[PDB]
């Protein structure tokens, strides 16, 4: 395709902040990638921000420092950013820019793609039709995740959400083994993980843990330490999504993308906007944050005629534990469902501190069902939730009514509360529970009472499951 020699300029009409203005450029185009070479020999990349006649502006990625007026080369590429996607990238580790960092070789690209991606036709959407298992009993049993659902995970500063993310990574998978393990051996599942805006301790911890779990043969990893250039923050997600797309729809696999710390994404985007001199929007965040998060989240689902899917589990932190902060508000609007973690539960030394009372789901009704699972799921979930809500409000009642006036059934509700928080929720970092184990523990916890109190379960399944 491209065959022309590239240009290079020694023109610098000025510099200001993280930008560098030049001119006398022939037929510039927007979003063109630009290299730079300083007097001391360092090489730095960049992108074109502004274009006006023969004037140009380039935001230098690595940060502007020591750029002379007359001694500075500026080569142009003439193409927008393009990713070298390839199936073989699994088992590797990269930085934000895509340069490998695990002592490995440059990726022998199998195909080149546009970093931005393209919108997917709503006509060719396919509704989800089956669940998955994340390895967490609290999440699978109480709140199903379909193929193609977009469930965020709200957390706050000071909670162990990162440990939960690592646990989800090292145990995510499928439950097709309902019928037979022989037909289950056909596994076509992979995970792509995008650590962004992460401090150094957590980056090392992630790398070590992922390497320890022994399933790195199906994990792609992207790291962007908080040291690296702030603009690389808002380029890491695009690379991750392009890779996930190429794997999903060109290899017919089942990919699970997990994004971390979207608050840092928001902050980096804010800084880019403010450097770009644009007028501020609400709360100092730019107006089109909605559109931007939309174009990031909307790349998933299922495609008619392709055997594959993309599931999204973004994570983010709520400043000041404020549920009406814009980032969680917009994230909730665009996405489907929500999962909480609560300070008090972590403060009860319960791991994972997953607060199911305000945790919802949107596709649970259709993710589960006969065949893809047992026939005894939805009623069990309803009963567990109802029992737990009764138990908690009843503890609130006994707090003042006195334990002496309590009925014996009241003690049964308290027993349910304590056992539910002792066994169902608490699992431990490596106790890989399956869905079937989770439902077994659920039935065991339900066995405390007679079927008469269990008024959310149909009698037909009571005659089968309750007397076990």
């Amino acid at each position: 395709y491209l065959s022309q020699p590239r240009l290079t300029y020694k023109t610098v009409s000025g510099v200001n902040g993280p930008l560098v203005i030049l001119d006398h450029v022939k037929f510039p185009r927007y979003a063109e990638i630009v290299h730079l070479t300083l007097p001391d020999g360092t090489k730095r990349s960049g992108q074109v921000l502004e274009v006006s006649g023969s004037k140009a502006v380039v935001q230098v990625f690595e940060g502007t420092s020591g750029i002379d007026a007359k001694k500075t080369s500026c080569e142009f590429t003439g193409d927008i950013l393009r990713t070298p996607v390839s199936e073989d990238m699994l088992g590797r580790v990269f930085n934000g820019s895509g340069k490998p960092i695990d002592r490995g070789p440059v990726v022998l690209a199998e195909d080149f793609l546009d970093i931005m991606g393209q919108p997917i036709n709503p006509q060719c959407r396919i509704y989800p039709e089956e669940m998955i298992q994340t390895g967490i009993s609290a999440i699978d049993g109480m709140n199903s995740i379909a193929r193609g659902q977009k469930i965020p995970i709200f957390s706050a500063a000071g909670l162990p959400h990162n440990e939960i993310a690592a646990q989800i990574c090292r145990q995510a998978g499928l439950v097709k083994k309902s019928k037979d393990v022989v037909d289950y051996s056909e596994e076509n599942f992979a995970i792509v993980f995008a650590a962004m805006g992460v401090n150094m301790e957590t980056a090392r911890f992630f790398k070590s843990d992922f390497e320890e779990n022994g399933s790195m043969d199906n994990v792609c990893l992207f790291l962007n330490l908080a040291n690296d250039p702030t603009i690389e923050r808002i380029i890491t997600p695009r690379l991750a999504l392009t890779t996930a797309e190429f794997l999903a729809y060109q290899c017919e696999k089942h990919v699970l993308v997990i994004l971390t710390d979207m608050s840092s994404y928001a902050e980096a985007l804010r800084e880019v906007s403010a450097a770009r001199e644009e007028v501020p929007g609400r709360r100092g965040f730019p107006g089109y944050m909605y559109t931007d998060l939309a174009t990031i989240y909307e790349r998933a689902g299922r495609v008619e005629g392709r055997n594959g899917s993309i599931t999204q589990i973004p994570i983010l932190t709520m400043p000041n534990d404020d549920i009406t902060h814009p980032i969680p508000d917009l994230t909730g609007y665009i996405t489907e469902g929500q999962i909480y973690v609560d300070r008090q539960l972590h403060n009860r030394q319960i791991y994972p501190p997953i607060n199911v009372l305000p945790s919802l789901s949107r596709l649970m009704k259709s993710a589960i069902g006969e065949g893809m699972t047992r026939k005894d799921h939805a009623d069990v979930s309803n009963q567990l939730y109802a029992c737990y809500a009764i138990g908690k409000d009843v503890q609130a009642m006994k707090a003042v009514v006195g334990e002496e006036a309590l009925t014996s059934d009241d003690l049964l509700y308290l027993e349910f509360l304590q056992k539910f928080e002792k066994n169902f929720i608490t699992q431990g970092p490596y106790e890989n529970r399956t869905v079937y184990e989770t439902l077994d523990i659920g039935w065991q916890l339900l066995r405390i009472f007679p079927k008469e109190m269990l008024k959310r379960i149909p009698q037909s399944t009571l005659s089968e499951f309750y007397p076990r």
């Binding site: 927007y30 979003a31 063109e32 006649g53 927008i80 393209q118 729809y249 644009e278 909307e298």
Partner: protein, 600 residues
């Protein structure tokens, strides 16, 4: 026409170096021909606002000058297809590309250009007869159900110079022509009309007919009106498109135009399933909803301006099908999404934030939207009559009615219906609150309800006061203990319970409750009110003098008749004749009389 493609602060991108051309017109940019919008003018420099991405566009790029502003194509074959905010036939695009993603600058007409269509001319006017705009001059049968009438656009008149013979013609064919005084002009079956303006009509007329809804609840209490304007809350878990299904199947409307913003392929595929599932025996034969309705939807990740233009193209299509003498219903759902879209548009205009970023002219756009509605006698020789309704789905943030859009819209619509998560969590179906819902059209529909039935108005009034009174006495029965009070109050709450349990609830899956004919609603409500009146007479008579008839006495002396009351719904009117049900109701009333007579 030189693409001085400036650098930008969003997907917007501008150009310059072009001659004089009017604004609010769309131009194509670059070799891939991305659409955009002229905003500002300055000498030979015109700012433009593209919709799609701005990556890769170079300076000097050709800027295709255009002759028309943003406009929708109109003509046969619209029904059943799917469109984006800029009128692209997504099904045809998917078929053409054999691709999953949407390409850029797909420059293909919305409607077919190679499929012929049967055509029946007027057969009453000749070549040379004078005609004016708005007059029907042809007919075409799109499908088994509806015939696409054909009429002149406004602003056109003259002495005809060609009349097509009946036959089969493609889109590009010239079916009409006429010589104005000085010049002439050729017209095809496809008309292009600007989006941001309202078609003319003969005159707007009052609303004097009630909208037909499948469910007697919200159809006998808070009646919507044909040609009306209403709003409904919308949140997950309670039901929003349930109303869409109910109106699309069981209503007297002749077409449904659905508008979507930020939706999933779910609603599209599910209403596609409703097409062969929700089928009607209009001619004694089940027939798909695809032949009637049309859909226009977009997703969040599509360009912003497309999201905004969606609702206007939806209005235009609704008006166009109304002009053909029909009864349109337009569900402009996800209104708060349109609000966020307007905020987005204002985010890149340096406008002053009136309230929470909302531009100043939010109220103007709200009014101009909801205005385009109501009954009209149409402009043209045939002298037909139709109307348009609008159903704006308000979606508050978690139940807070404080956003300027919510309040501004609640003071404009006249019918508002309840929807609360609590009722759906109570297993009470349909989820209608009845205490935050109202209807201001009651004075209008009095004439209609008086002419045809002559009792229904007292019945609904009495029902309303009884219900509010019960909600009032809830506090007193809380105080006393719900085990001791006067007998008259007891019978009042008991009739309230009976109406609540048997009349103000409707199983959407039961064969005899899948639709509720209005005559059956009238009979049910009248017989109930008669029962309560007779019980009140008896209890009061025995309470004043002696031998007080307590609610136990009435339960045991009339309990089988109470089973009859609660079994009045087991009728199955779809097969059982109306006369049979009327006879059953009258016989039950006579049995009621016998039981009360022997009560005292």
């Amino acid at each position: 026409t030189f693409g001085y493609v400036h650098g930008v602060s969003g997907p917007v991108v501008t150009a310059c170096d072009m001659a004089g051309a009017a604004m609010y017109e769309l131009v194509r940019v670059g070799h891939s021909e991305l659409v955009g919008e002229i905003i500002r003018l300055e000498g030979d420099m015109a700012t433009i606002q593209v919709y799609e991405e701005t990556s890769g566009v170079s300076v000097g790029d050709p800027v295709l000058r255009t002759g028309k502003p943003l406009s929708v194509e109109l003509g046969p074959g619209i029904m059943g297809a799917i469109f984006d905010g800029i009128q692209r036939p997504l099904s045809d695009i998917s078929s053409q590309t054999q691709s999953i993603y949407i390409p850029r600058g797909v420059n293909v007409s919305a409607l077919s250009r190679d499929i012929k269509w049967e055509f029946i001319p007027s057969k009453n006017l000749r070549v040379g007869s004078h005609i004016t705009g708005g007059d029907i001059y042809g007919i075409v049968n799109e499908n088994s159900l509806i015939k696409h009438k054909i009429m002149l656009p406004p602003r056109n008149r003259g002495s005809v110079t060609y009349i097509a013979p009946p036959g089969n013609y493609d889109a590009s064919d010239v079916v009409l022509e006429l010589e104005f005084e000085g010049v002439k002009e050729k017209f095809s079956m496809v008309q292009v009309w600007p989006v941001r303006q309202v078609r003319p009509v003969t005159e707007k007329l009052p609303a004097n007919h009630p909208l037909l809804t499948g469910q007697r609840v919200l159809d006998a209490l808070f009646p919507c009106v044909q040609g009306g304007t209403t709003a409904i809350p919308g949140a997950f878990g309670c039901g929003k498109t349930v109303i869409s299904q109910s109106l699309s199947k069981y209503s007297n409307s002749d077409v449904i135009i659905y508008v979507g913003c930020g939706e999933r392929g779910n609603e599209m595929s599910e209403v596609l399933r409703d097409f062969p599932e929700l089928t009607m025996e209009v001619d004694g034969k089940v027939e798909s909803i695809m032949k009637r309705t049309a859909l226009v939807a977009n997703t969040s990740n599509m360009p912003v301006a497309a999201r905004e233009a969606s609702i206007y193209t939806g209005i235009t299509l609704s008006e166009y099908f109304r002009d053909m003498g029909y009864h349109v219903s337009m569900m402009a759902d996800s209104t708060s999404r349109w609000a966020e879209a307007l905020r987005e548009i204002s985010g890149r205009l340096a406008e002053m934030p009136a309230d929470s970023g909302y531009p100043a002219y939010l109220g103007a756009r709200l009014a101009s939207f909801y205005e385009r509605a109501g009954r009209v006698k149409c402009l043209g020789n045939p002298e037909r009559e139709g109307s348009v309704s609008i159903v704006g789905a308000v979606s508050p943030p978690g139940g807070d009615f404080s956003d300027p859009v919510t309040s501004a819209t609640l003071g404009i619509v006249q019918v508002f219906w309840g929807l609360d998560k609590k009722l759906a969590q109570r297993k009470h179906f349909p989820s209608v609150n009845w205490l935050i819902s109202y209807s201001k059209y009651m004075r209008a529909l009095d004439e209609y309800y008086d002419k045809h039935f002559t009792e229904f108005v007292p019945l609904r009034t009495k029902a309303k006061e009884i219900l509010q009174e019960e909600e009032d006495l809830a506090e007193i029965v809380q105080l006393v203990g719900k085990a001791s009070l006067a007998e008259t109050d007891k019978i009042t709450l008991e009739v309230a319970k009976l109406i609540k349990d048997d009349f103000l609830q409707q199983n959407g899956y039961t064969p005899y409750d899948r639709f509720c004919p209005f005559y059956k609603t009238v009979g049910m409500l009248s017989n109930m009110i008669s029962f309560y009146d007779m019980a009140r007479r008896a209890v009061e008579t025995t309470a004043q003098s002696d031998n007080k008839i307590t609610w136990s006495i009435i339960r045991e002396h009339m309990g089988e008749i109470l089973y009859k009351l609660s079994s009045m719904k087991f009728k199955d009117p779809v097969k059982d004749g109306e006369a049979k049900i009327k006879a059953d109701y009258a016989q039950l009333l006579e049995d009621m009389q016998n039981a009360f007579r022997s009560l005292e």
